[PDB]
Design a binder for this molecule. Structure first.
Ligand SMILES: Cc1cc2nc3c(=O)[nH]c(=O)nc-3n(C[C@H](O)[C@H](O)[C@H](O)COP(=O)(O)OP(=O)(O)OC[C@H]3O[C@@H](n4cnc5c(N)ncnc54)[C@H](O)[C@@H]3O)c2cc1C
Length: 427
């Protein structure tokens, strides 16, 4: 039934060997949990393995691969509801949903993530400030718990506490077998985008707190983290909203829902070029153009700093560029309101993802960053993390004790466990 397998997160680091059950048979899954529950080092569900960290592996224990469980059960355009197996991925879901005029309500940077993964990490996207994160759009889920019973959870009424502990719970309340998502109605597969380019960090912040952000449903930015000030924190901002059919050019209006370095570069002329090409209004783009503006030895690092703490945010960015650690691929966004999940990552404030080449001193440098992020009231994302301490984590997520208490009810015997749970002491 199982197979000894060497697993790593997307970051290809911190490997552990587990026994991996891969089956499309939901009853065999129920029975494997029932088995582990009788006996140990517990079990954890795994999706497409896109989380960079250690949350979907379980050294010396059981790992259940959920991807073969990928049935879309129904889609209903009138209710906007979608009933799907947890192994369904968001790209699969997106293609199936389109002909109904339905848009996946939250999309992350890659569509190769399972619904179970999207819920357990409570994922966010370019529309977080207008739409929240993934958990906000789940109307029901079926959770396989430690007792081998399947519980039907909904965001309100009874069992809401377990529901909201599961969202962002990193698989640690049990296995999401199935869920109902409420989709976003759309009449097209396209975006209308405005683009803006700023010349400094001070400007980037300025553009994000002037009010204009309320005019867009989607917003994010490419961020210079390498240049010394003033150029530090300059950005290319891409903001927009889903087009309606009347906004499409003629050629595209018959099929509105279908998805299908020189010598000048670092000089004044390319400064003008980049500025010009990054500044546009009412441009219609497909998903790949708008949302997908696109390995081994890198360290992903993502944090959010509370909105008010803006001077502290500027401080952290300053620390980053003068560190001698250079990140070229940086994504910035202002998050909106948070949800009620205790371990949910997003909070209203300044969010950034960076990507550091693995190098001498980087490990000790990120620990120091951790300290700064913590002190500044912010947190890091478990999906992007493999090396922070339990002490740092628990301070970053003050409702962790609230969460752990919920987990102890539903898993007294510690049937569900992962590398991350042990490292972060969520066990
Ligand atoms: C290139 C890239 C870009 C990304 N961009 C973003 C982004 O913009 N925003 C964002 O929020 N994230 C982003 N991520 C992270 C990704 O969205 C999350 O890590 C997501 O959880 C990955 O889903 P997965 O199916 O691969 O799950 P895995 O990585 O396999 O698992 C992640 C967690 O979900 C749990 N889980 C999986 N299935 C189940 C289940 N059926 N029941 C219970 N628990 C389950 C696992 O136990 C594990 O704890 C990105 C990742 C990559 C590689």
């Amino acid at each position: 039934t199982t197979t000894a397998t060497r697993l790593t997160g997307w970051g290809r680091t911190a490997p552990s060997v587990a026994n991996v059950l891969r089956t499309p048979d939901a009853e065999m899954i129920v029975k494997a949990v029932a088995r582990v529950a009788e006996s140990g080092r517990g079990a954890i569900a795994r999706g497409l393995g896109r989380s960079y960290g250690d949350n979907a592996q379980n050294g010396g224990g059981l790992v259940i691969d959920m991807t073969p469980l990928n049935t879309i059960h129904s889609i209903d355009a009138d209710t906007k509801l979608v009933d799907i197996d947890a192994g369904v991925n968001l790209d699969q879901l997106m293609k199936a949903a389109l002909p109904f005029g339905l848009w996946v309500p939250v999309l992350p940077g890659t569509r190769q993530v399972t619904v179970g993964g999207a819920i357990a990490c409570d994922i966010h996207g370019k529309n977080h400030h207008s739409a929240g994160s993934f958990g906000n759009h789940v109307r029901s889920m079926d959770l396989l718990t430690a007792d081998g019973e399947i519980r039907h959870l909904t965001p309100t009424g009874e069992d809401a506490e377990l529901f909201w502990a599961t969202v962002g719970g990193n698989g640690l309340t049990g296995i999401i077998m199935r869920a109902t998502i409420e989709m976003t109605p759309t009449s097209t597969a396209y975006f209308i985008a405005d683009g803006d380019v700023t010349a400094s960090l001070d400007e980037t912040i300025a553009l994000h707190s002037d009010g204009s952000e309320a005019r867009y449903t989607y917003s994010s930015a490419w961020f210079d983290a390498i240049s010394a000030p003033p150029k530090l924190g300059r950005a290319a901002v891409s903001r927009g909203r889903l087009a309606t059919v009347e906004q499409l050019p003629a050629k595209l209006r018959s099929e509105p829902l279908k998805f299908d370095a020189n010598k000048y570069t670092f000089g004044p002329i390319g400064e003008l070029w980049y500025r010009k090409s990054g500044t546009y209004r009412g441009k219609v783009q497909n998903l790949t153009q708008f949302y997908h503006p696109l390995p081994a030895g890198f360290l992903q690092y993502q944090f959010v700093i509370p909105t008010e703490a803006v001077d502290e945010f500027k401080k952290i960015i300053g620390v980053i560029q003068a560190s001698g650690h250079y990140s070229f691929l940086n994504v910035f966004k202002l998050f909106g309101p948070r949800n009620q999940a205790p371990l949910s990552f997003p909070i209203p404030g300044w969010n950034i993802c960076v990507d550091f080449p693995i190098k001498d001193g980087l490990g000790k440098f990120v620990s120091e960053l951790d300290r700064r992020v913590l002190e500044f009231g912010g947190r890091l994302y478990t999906a992007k993390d493999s090396r922070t301490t339990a002490e740092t984590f628990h301070a970053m997520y003050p409702r962790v004790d609230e969460w752990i208490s919920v987990r102890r009810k539903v898993d007294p015997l510690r049937v569900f466990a992962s590398d991350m749970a042990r490292r972060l002491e969520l066990l």
